[PDB]
């Protein structure tokens, strides 16, 4: 039972790693959008913060 649980845990960790990488990419894109908007003049400093 322990061996099976460990194998399943490894697979779940791989999937979660992929999901969190995608989330990081999305957050970076949103931050870049906010920074560009602030530079243009449609945003405040608190939004990019």
């Amino acid at each position: 039972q322990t061996v099976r649980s460990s194998f399943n845990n490894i697979n779940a960790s791989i999937s979660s790693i992929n999901a969190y990488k995608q989330a990081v990419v999305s957050a970076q894109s949103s931050l870049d959008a906010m920074e560009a908007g602030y530079s243009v003049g449609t945003r405040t400093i608190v939004d990019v913060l």
């Binding site: 697979n11 999937s15 894109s29």
Partner: protein, 50 residues
């Protein structure tokens, strides 16, 4: 599984909207992140059942 189907259809809708052009790329990236999250949740549920 039902949640995964719903999220996939939502992602397809967002992709079509961007393709014709109605929303920015940030929405598309967020939808892709949600789809990846629901896929990971499905994998976790399958392993829990096992």
């Amino acid at each position: 599984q039902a949640q995964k189907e719903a999220i996939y259809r939502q992602l397809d809708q967002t992709t079509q909207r961007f393709n014709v052009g109605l929303v920015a790329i940030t929405d598309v990236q967020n939808a892709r992140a949600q789809y990846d999250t629901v896929l990971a949740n499905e994998v976790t549920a399958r392993n829990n059942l096992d």
